[PDB]
Amino acid sequence: KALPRLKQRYREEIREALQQEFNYANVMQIPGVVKVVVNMGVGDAARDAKLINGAINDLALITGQKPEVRRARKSIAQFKLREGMPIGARVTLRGDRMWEFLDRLISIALPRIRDFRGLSPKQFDGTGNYTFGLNEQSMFHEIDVDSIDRPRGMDITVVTTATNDAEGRALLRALGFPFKEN
RNA sequence: AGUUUAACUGGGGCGGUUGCCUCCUAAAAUGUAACGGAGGCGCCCAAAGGUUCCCUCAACCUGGACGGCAAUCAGGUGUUGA
Secondary structure (H helix, E strand, C coil), X not given: CCCCHHHXXXXXXXXXXXXXXXXXXXXXXXXXXXXXXXXXXXXXXXXXXXXXXXXXXXXXXXXXXXXXXXXXXXXXXXXXXXXXXXXXXXXXXXXHHHHHHHHHXXXXXXXXXXXXCCECCCCECCCCCEEEEECCCCCCCCCCHHHCCCCCCXXXXXXXXXXXXXXXXXXXXXXXXXXXXX
């Protein structure tokens, strides 16, 4: 029909490749990309919550979704933080938007960041769910670079049905993630 | 000039206290004294009430850019210690 590039590639070849690398007794034990979450934790919004709107605009122009403004769970004296205030913009991404954002990320943004010597393959939680982070936003072409007054990084996590870092790493590298060899 | 100027009080005075709520004392019903042991109240909320629906934390582990023990994100453990 009109499936995303990455998704048709996934269910055409990557599933079989993962089966070969890990002979799974059941097809439903195959790893799959559940979701990707883009956090934009901005703790600098406590003193002034005017940076959160820029975080929102950035995440929207990146992913395609209005983010969820994560109110603080707790007040912290050191971080100048009360409860309930806007610290962080989260976007959950599932399905077609997820696959499209991953293709965009891989094929555009990661080679667009300065001095891209790869992403660490050790950055797995222990359940085949990856998480890396960025220090800025201009790596996404969707943003007008002239309109970037403040750098605003993020934490991108890719959570999968994999049950270990090995299968997760296989899946991500098959999708085409830049895992440097260390 | 007429009068008032409290009481409890291990004598009285000084000090402290005086009403309400919670615990212990209190002896497994209730209740139970002491200038016995500890605290709190003299409000707040127009939602912090009503109802319908939904959810389940804290803590810990692991991974994560600033981010640090601890901000927000992900996964897991977690039947309750929040």
